[PDB]
Amino acid sequence: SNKERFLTLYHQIKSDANGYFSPEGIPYHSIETLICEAPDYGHMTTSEAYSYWLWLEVLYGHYTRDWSKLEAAWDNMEKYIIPVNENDEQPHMSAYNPSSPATYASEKPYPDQYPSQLSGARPAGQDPIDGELKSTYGTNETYLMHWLLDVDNWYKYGNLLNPSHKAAYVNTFQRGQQESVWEAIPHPSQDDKSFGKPNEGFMSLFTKENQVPAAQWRYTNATDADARAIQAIYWAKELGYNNSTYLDKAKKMGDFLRYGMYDKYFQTIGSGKQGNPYPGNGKGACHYLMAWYTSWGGGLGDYANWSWRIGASHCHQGYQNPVAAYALSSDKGGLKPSSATGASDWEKTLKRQLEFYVWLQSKEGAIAGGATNSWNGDYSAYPAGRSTFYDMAYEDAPVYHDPPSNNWFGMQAWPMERVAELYYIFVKDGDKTSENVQMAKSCITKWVNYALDYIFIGSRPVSDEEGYFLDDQGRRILGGTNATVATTSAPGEFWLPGNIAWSGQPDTWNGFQSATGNPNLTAVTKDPTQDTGVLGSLVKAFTFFAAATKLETGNYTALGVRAKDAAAQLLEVAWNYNDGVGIVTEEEREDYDRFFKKEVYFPNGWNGTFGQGNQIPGSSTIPSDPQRGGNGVYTSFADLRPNIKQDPAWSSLESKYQSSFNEATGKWENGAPVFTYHRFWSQVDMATAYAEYHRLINLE
Numbered sequence: 001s002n003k004e005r006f007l008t009l010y011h012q013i014k015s016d017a018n019g020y021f022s023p024e025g026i027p028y029h030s031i032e033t034l035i036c037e038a039p040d041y042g043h044m045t046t047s048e049a050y051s052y053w054l055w056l057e058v059l060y061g062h063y064t065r066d067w068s069k070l071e072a073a074w075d076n077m078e079k080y081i082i083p084v085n086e087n088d089e090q091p092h093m094s095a096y097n098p099s100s101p102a103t104y105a106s107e108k109p110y111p112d113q114y115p116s117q118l119s120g121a122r123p124a125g126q127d128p129i130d131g132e133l134k135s136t137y138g139t140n141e142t143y144l145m146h147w148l149l150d151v152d153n154w155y156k157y158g159n160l161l162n163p164s165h166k167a168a169y170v171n172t173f174q175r176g177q178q179e180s181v182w183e184a185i186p187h188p189s190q191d192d193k194s195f196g197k198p199n200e201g202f203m204s205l206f207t208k209e210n211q212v213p214a215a216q217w218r219y220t221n222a223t224d225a226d227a228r229a230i231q232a233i234y235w236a237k238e239l240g241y242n243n244s245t246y247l248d249k250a251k252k253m254g255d256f257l258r259y260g261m262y263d264k265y266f267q268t269i270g271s272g273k274q275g276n277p278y279p280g281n282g283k284g285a286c287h288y289l290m291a292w293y294t295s296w297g298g299g300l301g302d303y304a305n306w307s308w309r310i311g312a313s314h315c316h317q318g319y320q321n322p323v324a325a326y327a328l329s330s331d332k333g334g335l336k337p338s339s340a341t342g343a344s345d346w347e348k349t350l351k352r353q354l355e356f357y358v359w360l361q362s363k364e365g366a367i368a369g370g371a372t373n374s375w376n377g378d379y380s381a382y383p384a385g386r387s388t389f390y391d392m393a394y395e396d397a398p399v400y401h402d403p404p405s406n407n408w409f410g411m412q413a414w415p416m417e418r419v420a421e422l423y424y425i426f427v428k429d430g431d432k433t434s435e436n437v438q439m440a441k442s443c444i445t446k447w448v449n450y451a452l453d454y455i456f457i458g459s460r461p462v463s464d465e466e467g468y469f470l471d472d473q474g475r476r477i478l479g480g481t482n483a484t485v486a487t488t489s490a491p492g493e494f495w496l497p498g499n500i501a502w503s504g505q506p507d508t509w510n511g512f513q514s515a516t517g518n519p520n521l522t523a524v525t526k527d528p529t530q531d532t533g534v535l536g537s538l539v540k541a542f543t544f545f546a547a548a549t550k551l552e553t554g555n556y557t558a559l560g561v562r563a564k565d566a567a568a569q570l571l572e573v574a575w576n577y578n579d580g581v582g583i584v585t586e587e588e589r590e591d592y593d594r595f596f597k598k599e600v601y602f603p604n605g606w607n608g609t610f611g612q613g614n615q616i617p618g619s620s621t622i623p624s625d626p627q628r629g630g631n632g633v634y635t636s637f638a639d640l641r642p643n644i645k646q647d648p649a650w651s652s653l654e655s656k657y658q659s660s661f662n663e664a665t666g667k668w669e670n671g672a673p674v675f676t677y678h679r680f681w682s683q684v685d686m687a688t689a690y691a692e693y694h695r696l697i698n699l700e
């Protein structure tokens with residue numbers, strides 16, 4: 001019974017004996033501690049994880065009719081990761097100037113070139129929503145999740161503005177597109193300058209100004225997480241939840257999530273196409289997409305009565321959530337905010353996001369990266385011939401190049417799951433005819449047919465040493481439609497693609513009626529693996545897709561049949577990978593030499609104290625690479641974080657590195673480290689896949 005399967009995994013996730021949650025009731029990134037991927041330690045948690053927790057409790061609440069666990073999860077979120085306090089967690093937010101939201105600085109192509117000068121070279125444009133939010137809520141305190149929490153206070157900064165909370169607000173990434181997770185420096189969101197460099201805190205690693213930096217706080221959301229929370233509440237409400245107390249909070253979150261629709265420095269959309277941006281007026285700086293983040297910050301202490309906000313200029317397809325956008329914009333969606341323009345902004349976003357998906361879809365069906373309003377992160381002129389979407393430049397790897405941000409196949413499964421939900425929702429709500437449903441449908445239908453060529457149940461694909469799939473004659477499959485991957489029998493196995501290698505560009509967008517099929521946009525799908533999180537996401541994309549086809553036509557379509565059977569089979573084989581704690585498989589991590597490599601940059605002349613009490617950078621360094629344009633040093637991830645050497649898994653990792661990694665070639669000669677991880681989101685993606693198959697397919 002898929003219902004019983006969901007219930008069993010739900011209990012495994014929630015059990016105090018399994019360790020998914022801390023003693024304060026906050027879900028961790030993962031049960032295991034030694035892991036690094038976006039958070040850099042397993043007992044960090046994320047806005048992402050909280051968003052999945054909500055989703056879990058929504059489907060549990062539908063089955064049990066007990067909504068109290070959803071409400072407790074929301075309460076927990078509000079207590080620990082949304083910095084509003086019913087002691088002020090956003091001091092001086094009231095002094096914000098919406099006619100000068102922030103002070104400009106350039107992004108850089110390497111971490112070595114930071115700190116960046118706070119020059120104000122570009123005057124920031126108008127913030128046109130601050131006034132509405134204030135009138136609507138009586139405050140401009142941001143009701144969004146900060147993205148990262150040190151749940152076990154492992155970095156030892158403490159929580160300045162809420163000291164009795166063990167979980168502390170921290171941040172890592174600050175230094176541009178080449179600062180991988182391995183290359184960042186963990187620092188407190190609320191910086192009283194008690195750590196870092198004396199008199200400066202960590203601020204002077206990131207920005208420079210004429211003066212010593214002031215004590216200050218700042219937060220950054222991840223727009224995909226807050227939207228996924230809204231998506232969860234959308235379904236709560238569809239499934240009968242009707243406590244206005246919480247419905248209203250999801251609407252509030254949605255209203256503030258509008259900050260994600262704005263250019264970083266509120267520059268007019270398109271205005272930097274020729275390298276000469278100018279400040280936005282009204283909504284001129286609104287791109288109506290979910291960019292990578294919004295940040296906010298201000299002074300700490302009595303002498304620092306200032307605050308600021310930035311949007312983001314870079315938008316990734318994998319972050320868009322049109323289910324949230326529909327929920328916040330229609331009577332049928334049910335979560336329209338009360339602000340004057342919140343719902344009508346979200347309505348424009350819903351359409352813009354579907355146009356973005358169609359624009360980005362490769363010749364063979366996969367979704368390419370996204371677009372930016374700030375080329376090179378300093379409003380550089382677009383390259384000659386670069387394709388555009390509403391005057392924003394196509395990017396194959398928005399925001400991060402290490403690794404390229406749209407290579408991970410999870411970035412296909414996560415957004416296409418939402419688009420499949422959305423197809424289902426439109427058709428359920430009686431819409432088969434709008435331009436929006438036609439876009440959603442076209443994109444998900446083309447994607448499903450693409451994806452099925454790389455999904456293997458009870459068979460094992462043939463791949464070569466470099467991770468290319470092979471056909472029956474042994475040739476590499478380099479994208480294209482109709483991929484025919486060679487296969488050997490492998491009862492009980494499943495395989496999914498792992499990455500995409502991207503080349504070319506979509507054609508410039510001129511609307512859905514002039515779309516071209518993007519014949520020069522190529523996805524090469526590669527690296528077969530067994531990621532159970534991606535599996536659970538895929539299953540749902542296939543489930544909702546199939547269900548939609550049957551609501552639309554009366555029967556499962558040809559492709560709907562195939563998507564439904566693939567879902568059923570994937571659920572059936574995955575069940576065998578339950579270890580009693582989660583549905584898991586073993587993974588190799590060839591990236592884990594980056595625990596040891598010297599690549600964490602510090603500027604010359606900069607010494608301070610890290611949270612764990614060590615002097616940083618300290619003496620274990622090499623000179624920075626002068627080709628990267630800095631003047632400083634590199635330490636290692638592990639020297640920066642000496643407490644990682646106390647982790648129970650550390651000596652096995654170090655021993656494996658000593659015996660297998662060859663520093664001169666940069667290769668793992670006797671195999672890479674291997675781990676079996678129990679990730680919270682991944683387990684939720686699996687549990688919800690069982691549930692939704694049961695609800696949409698077994699019951700209807």
Ligand SMILES: OC[C@H]1CNC[C@@H](O)[C@@H]1O[C@@H]1O[C@H](CO)[C@@H](O[C@@H]2O[C@H](CO)[C@@H](O)[C@H](O)[C@H]2O)[C@H](O)[C@H]1O
Pocket residue numbers: 038039046047048147171172173174176220221222223224225292293295399
């Ligand atoms: O585990 C959750 C992360 C990975 N999946 C999607 C999101 O839920 C979340 O992403 C992270 O979200 C963080 C918050 O937006 C991103 O960090 C931000 O990256 C921004 C610039 O790249 C920085 O300006 C900002 O200070 C920093 O906080 C980070 O790159 C990005 O990977």
Ligand SMILES: OC[C@H]1CNC[C@@H](O)[C@@H]1O[C@@H]1O[C@H](CO)[C@@H](O[C@@H]2O[C@H](CO)[C@@H](O)[C@H](O)[C@H]2O)[C@H](O)[C@H]1O
Pocket residue numbers: 037038039048408410498529530531533534587588589590591679
């Ligand atoms: O080391 C590469 C792969 C080895 N084979 C199995 C794969 O499962 C593994 O891929 C990694 O799989 C991880 C688990 O799905 C991926 O981690 C995820 O990366 C996501 C995107 O940054 C994050 O939002 C999320 O928090 C984080 O857990 C990570 O990117 C991805 O590279």
Ligand SMILES: OC[C@H]1CNC[C@@H](O)[C@@H]1O[C@@H]1O[C@H](CO)[C@@H](O)[C@H](O)[C@H]1O
Pocket residue numbers: 101102103104105118207213214216297306307308310
């Ligand atoms: O470039 C804008 C912000 C992005 N990253 C960190 C922030 O401190 C930057 O904001 C500026 O901080 C300044 C003082 O430190 C402040 O006086 C400006 O008003 C802020 O934009």
Ligand SMILES: [Ca+2]
Pocket residue numbers: 078079080081082083084085089
């Ligand atoms: Ca709070």
Ligand SMILES: [Ca+2]
Pocket residue numbers: 178179180183402
């Ligand atoms: Ca790098």
Ligand code: NA
Pocket residue numbers: 161162163164165
């Ligand atoms: Na407190």
